[PDB]
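Worked problem 6 (solution included).
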Amino acid sequence: SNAMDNKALLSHVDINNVVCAMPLPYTRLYEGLASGLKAQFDGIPFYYAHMRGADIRVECLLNGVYDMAVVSRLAAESYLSQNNLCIALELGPHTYVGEHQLICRKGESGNVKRVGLDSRSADQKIMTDVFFGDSDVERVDLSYHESLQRIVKGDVDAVIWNVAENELTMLGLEATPLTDDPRFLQATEAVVLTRVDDYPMQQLLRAVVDKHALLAHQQRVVSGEQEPSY
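Solution. The predicted structure is:
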């Protein structure tokens, strides 16, 4: 019904399949998002392309490879200054990833001069630039792995990363929740981008998606009540 109502919309658009680019589905939260969104497309051939890196998903989308791309609100807000894009769906906070924190050696948060930064992480770059402001802080190209390891070493002073009270203490580290700025929470919000002039895809998403239903399905996947299907 809902499905057949969806199938009927596809009949009037030059869209066969809908291909959505999103991260590799390596958290239960990503799975619930992936599962909740596809469920909104019942009756429409809908498939995920799982592609590491927000930048390349957006580049692909811009080049016409995908109909839509999933990224964080924080990234998306930047992409829109740089490219002609549409934020077609916004899911609110805590729909994409967990909170981030500032990880450094114990009590040395006031003494930060070098920061680890993964080149592949669009959000970590933005958040590092936002948090370290007009401060003389050196950025070092490191995976968190390498950053953590190097922070333990003593060379690199900090990394902004996903948030655990105990492991950190064992390594002589500390994690600080991030100062205030609305952008940090934007990092946890899933959004769907389309090309700015792709009205068929924008309008189809508006037609098919029930935001609260998508969210409740995500919730049921995260609680283990329901298994994901994506």
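Discussion: The domain at 1-96+188-230 is CATH 3.40.190.10 (D-Maltodextrin-Binding Protein; domain 2).
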